[PDB]
């Protein structure tokens, strides 16, 4: 039925004669058909939060009801496309309107109804049988790299009465008929799934395999795990490119909920040009990747819903028997949006203005990652790795967002106190930097690398010893000097990764192992006494200055042109030079 | 009991947030439970929060999503939330509301109880006397836990405290003097935890053959907050039933009550009460007191109850309201230090700032052994001196030290090597810990044992 707007207050819209409306029922507003959703009920008089500016809307305008809550659209062709926070096809919209501006484009389908993909039914199916459902029933015959296999919506299982033959179809036509109950059914290649629900699964299993990244600091101190969860300061975007490039990531999802506009144009320009070369065939990484753009320009609820939309997409592709590596640009801006909307509702706030349920919502966003066993007759597994970003607030440690985040995230890394070098982006804060996956991965490490096992501990020993003695130095034995100069070298070389240069754009784990082994073996045979083993530190420095320069200049060996063998050989030669210097010391 | 039929309503004035306004209710009660039936056929449950006039507002555990303004219905239990309880609940697992998590059946109601609990008459409280074996050298030798002593543990985020709790549960028990260990039981309660550290508990506690004396509760982070606030009281009430109505000694373990405080903030925000210190209601002190003071022995009974909760300190701040108040209403604390965790010592316990207020009665000759107190005090003092001597060495150099300083440094080193480190499965008996302590003490020569009475030295030192 129809309604009438009783009042307007910024992005809020009071209305009347809305008896029977649901809690999150979508609704169109005004003659512009602005999209919104129910928030509060007060009898027939309700309140609606809208997704676009309300300027010009008058009193008494029509209000149309719909029968669905917020939902996303699914099917072929999602990969390789770009979407808004409420799943608008930006590219197709700019194509149709042929104008730079975004009009009030209230009617456009997420996936084109004209492009036809070659559907192929599974051979094991037979028409007119009593299979009683099962998920997989067909497959898109080809895309560039990833075949978009098709499944049956959950909660809907039934016998078979007709299956379409092989052929090209536009996804607007029906290929399934699964009556099974005296009530006929029809399904195309397109599904609708509510965003805020959770797609059920058969089972969840513990982590059983690591995750590889290029960054040395993540790989050595706080390794990540496939199917894992992590948070990283937002002080970086190259990490998404690196994990897609090297790690075993099938599909990539990147979501900018509130990024700056220029950086978002930067990403849009640079991302498609990149390539993968899976097996010598140069293939664009965009083919295995989908985007959800949302700058600060868009209204509040677009930013609110971008995260949930992305998580729904990742879950859907997880069900398809793949591995997905998601990264969110930031969570602080989402929290600010929540603050703004809570203040709009005039619901009384908690500390720092944030609504009390912030922790509950952050829990809802998390606890959806992990390795799982999908729901289906064909057995398969899907992994979801979530990499959130906590942009540094003014109160880094005291931010409620950070406090709630540290109560959930399995593995966390953070920046130390803001150093004099504002460009010290690969820092480390030993106060709060930790991991929770050492137990489930040492068995894997033992079969590949074993030298690092005491070295990782010894590095921490050295760093904490320096941290203890530093304040005393500021306000003096030689061994103290050896410790602090080694720690300074470690911070100057092992940390402070560049990223924007090829020689530190990516680093294989073996390069890290070699350079760290050399850098720490420097200390392992220089701390045995004030001498080489049981002079002073100044004597050691004067004796081995060239050694220190070469230790520093390890970093420049580019993996791109220099293979692993050559860099290993150079490091080993430098180690031999260090040994020669030790013998003459 | 109740004999009148249950009622059903469809009058729904509106909804605001997680609360639902109804009207035209005859004699509504304060905290009576109700059920909800969405028009699509889903089931839900909730608790009446506030009542005024013929109107009555209700919170919903599973969320207020999908509620229809005119096509929903509700039913009134007409009574306060009661729990089914029985001694056979051992070996089971639940989700806070009592719904089984494993594949077992519903618990038979051997009895019904009120979850809110009751205060305890102070006249009946009996001073704790005995001690509970824990299998950890730090908790048993250097410190102690009596039959009734409420000892929290502080631990900053990201440090291994769940492992300590799990090992305590696995290796819990009583001192074998020569009405045995069968009387001992455990009630474990974990709240606001990740799905990891939950599968870990449910698997590992099964892998070590100990479900015969454990009653476990889990509440993941994504669960309703009202489940979180409800669960610990449920645990305490089942503990009280199993310990007092049936003669048992019960060790209750609570994990991360900071999340319980977060849920308390949630419910306070729902009721629109003005926040105070650090966004916490003032009455949270009395609330925590209600969750505490369910321990100690009682005359006319041979049982006991002992609480060992765990807390997450925000940014190592002792003056934060949570740990400060907890200290105001607890009898000691055990610290966990970051540097020790970085030193790859599996038990990271830092025994220096820790302190137990009831050492003097928990041990003695009739207890584990007579020499225990002397050994403990001497160990503590000489460790303090050893840390001081390492500080001395930091500047004065090794050549400027005496033989005594070398003894202190060597003793310190061997002490963290052996006394502190246990291993994830090494269940040490108390006598074994005292033997290790004596072996370490023997390094120093006879005369330096200033804290040791001479008779004990003659008996044990040789």
């Amino acid at each position: 039925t129809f309604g009438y707007v009783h009042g307007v207050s910024g992005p809020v819209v009071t209305a009347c004669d809305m008896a029977g409306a649901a809690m999150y029922e979508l609704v169109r507003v005004g003659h512009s058909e602005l999209v919104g959703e129910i928030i509060r009920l007060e009898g027939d008089m309700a309140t609606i939060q809208v997704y676009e500016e309300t300027s010009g809307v008058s009193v008494g305008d029509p209000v149309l009801r719909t029968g669905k809550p917020l939902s996303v659209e699914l099917g072929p062709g999602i990969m390789g496309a770009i979407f808004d926070g409420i799943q608008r096809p930006l590219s197709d919209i700019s194509s149709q309107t042929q104008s730079i501006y975004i009009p009030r484009g209230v009617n456009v389908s997420a996936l084109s109804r004209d492009i036809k993909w070659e559907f192929i039914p599974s051979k094991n199916l037979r028409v007119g049988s009593h299979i009683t459902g099962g998920d997989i029933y067909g497959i898109v015959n080809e895309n560039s790299l990833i075949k978009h296999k098709i499944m049956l919506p959950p909660r809907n299982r039934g016998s078979v009465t007709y299956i379409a033959p092989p052929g090209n179809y536009d996804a607007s036509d029906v290929v399934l008929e699964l009556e099974f109950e005296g009530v006929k059914e029809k399904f195309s290649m397109v599904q609708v799934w509510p965003v805020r629900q959770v797609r059920p699964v058969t089972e969840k299993l513990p982590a059983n395999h690591p995750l590889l990244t290029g960054q040395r600091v993540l790989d050595a101190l706080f390794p990540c795990v496939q199917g894992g969860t992590t948070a990283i300061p937002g002080a970086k975007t190259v990490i998404s490119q690196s994990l897609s490039k090297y790690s075993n990531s099938d599909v990539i999802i990147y979501v900018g909920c509130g990024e700056r506009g220029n950086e978002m144009s930067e990403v849009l320009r640079d991302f498609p040009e990149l390539t993968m070369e899976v097996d010598g065939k140069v293939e664009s990484i965009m083919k295995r990747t989908a985007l959800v753009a949302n700058t600060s320009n868009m209204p509040v609820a677009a930013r609110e819903a971008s995260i949930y939309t992305g998580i729904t997409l990742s879950e859907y592709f997880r069900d398809m028997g793949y591995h997905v590596s998601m990264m969110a640009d930031s969570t602080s801006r989402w929290a600010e949006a929540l603050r703004e909307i809570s203040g709009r509702l005039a619901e009384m706030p908690a500390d720092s203005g944030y609504p009390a349920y912030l922790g509950a919502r952050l829990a809802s966003f998390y606890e959806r990652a992990g390795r799982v066993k999908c729901l289906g007759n064909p057995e398969r597994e899907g992994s979801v790795s979530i990499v959130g970003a906590v942009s540094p607030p003014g109160g880094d440690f005291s931010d409620p967002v950070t406090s709630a985040t540290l109560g959930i995230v399995q593995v966390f890394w953070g920046l130390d106190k803001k150093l004099a070098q504002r460009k010290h982006f690969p820092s480390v804060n030993w106060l709060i930097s930790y991991s929770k996956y050492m137990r489930a991965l040492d068995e894997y490490y033992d079969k590949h690398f074993t030298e690092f096992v005491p070295l990782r501990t010894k590095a921490k020993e050295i760093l904490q010893e320096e941290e203890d003695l530093a304040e005393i130095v500021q306000l003096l034995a030689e061994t103290d000097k050896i410790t602090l100069e080694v720690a300074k070298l470690i911070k100057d070389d092992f940390l402070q990764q560049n990223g924007y240069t090829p020689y530190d754009r990516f680093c294989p784990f073996y390069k890290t192992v070699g350079m760290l082994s050399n850098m720490i073996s420097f200390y392992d045979m220089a701390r045995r006494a004030v001498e080489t083993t049981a002079i002073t530190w100044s004597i050691i420095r004067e004796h081995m200055g060239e050694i220190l320069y070469k230790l520093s200049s390890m970093k420049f060996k580019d993996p791109v042109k220099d293979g692993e063998a050559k860099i290993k050989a150079d490091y080993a030669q430098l180690l031999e030079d260090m040994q020669n210097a030790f013998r003459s010391l | 009991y109740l004999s009148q039929p249950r009622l059903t309503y469809k009058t729904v004035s509106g909804v605001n947030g997680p609360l639902v306004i109804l009207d035209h209710v005859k004699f509504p009660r304060y905290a009576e439970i109700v059920h909800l039936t969405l028009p699509d056929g889903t089931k839900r449950s909730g608790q009446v929060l506030e009542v005024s006039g013929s109107k009555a507002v209700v919170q919903v555990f599973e969320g207020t999503s999908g509620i229809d303004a005119k096509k929903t219905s509700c039913e009134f239990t007409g009574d306060i939330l009661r729990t089914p309880v029985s001694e056979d609940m051992l070996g089971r697992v639940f989700n806070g509301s009592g719904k089984p998590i494993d594949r077992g059946p519903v618990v038979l109601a051997e009895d019904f109880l009120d979850i809110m609990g009751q205060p305890i008459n102070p006249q009946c409280r009996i001073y704790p006397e005995e001690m509970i074996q824990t299998g950890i050298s730090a908790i048993d030798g250097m410190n102690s836990i009596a039959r009734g002593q409420k000892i929290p543990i502080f631990s900053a985020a990201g440090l291994p405290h769940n492992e300590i709790a799990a090992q305590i549960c696995r290796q819990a028990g009583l001192v074998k003097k020569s009405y045995s260990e069968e009387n001992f039981a455990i009630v474990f309660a974990a709240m606001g935890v990740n799905m990891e550290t939950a599968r870990f508990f449910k698997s590992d506690f099964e892998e070590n053959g100990s479900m015969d004396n454990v009653c476990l509760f889990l509440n993941l982070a994504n669960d309703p907050t009202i489940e979180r606030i409800i669960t610990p009281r449920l645990a305490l009430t089942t503990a009280e039933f199993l310990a007092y109505q049936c003669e048992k000694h019960v060790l209750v373990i609570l994990t991360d009550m900071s999340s319980y405080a977060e849920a308390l903030r949630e419910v306070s925000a729902a009721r629109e009460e003005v926040p105070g210190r650090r966004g916490f209601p003032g009455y949270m002190y009395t609330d925590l007191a209600t969750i505490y003071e369910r321990a100690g022995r009682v005359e006319g009974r041979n049982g006991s109850i002992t609480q060992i909760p765990i807390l997450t300190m925000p940014n190592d701040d002792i003056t934060h309201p949570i740990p400060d108040l907890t200290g105001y209403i607890t009898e000691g604390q055990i610290y966990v230090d970051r540097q020790l965790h970085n030193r790859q010592i599996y038990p990271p316990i830092n025994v220096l700032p820790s302190l137990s207020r009831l050492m003097k009665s928990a041990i003695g000759e009739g207890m584990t052994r007579k020499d225990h107190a002397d050994v403990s005090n001497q160990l503590y003092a000489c460790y303090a001196i050893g840390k001081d001597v390492q500080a001395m060495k930091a500047v004065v150099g090794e050549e400027a030290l005496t033989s005594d300083d070398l003894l202190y440094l060597e003793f310190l080193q061997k002490f963290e090597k052996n006394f502190i480190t246990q291993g994830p499965y090494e269940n040490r008996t108390v006598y074994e810990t005292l033997d290790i302590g004596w072996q370490l003490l023997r390094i120093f020569p006879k005369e330096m044992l200033k804290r040791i009475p001479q008779s004990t030295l003659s008996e044990f030192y040789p």
């Binding site: 005039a346 009384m348 | 629109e272 003005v274 926040p275 105070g276």
Partner: peptide
């Protein structure tokens, strides 16, 4: 705290 008290006071109408 004073701001919050005032907004509640006004909300009582």
């Amino acid at each position: 705290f004073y701001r919050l008290k005032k907004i509640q006071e006004k909300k009582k109408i």
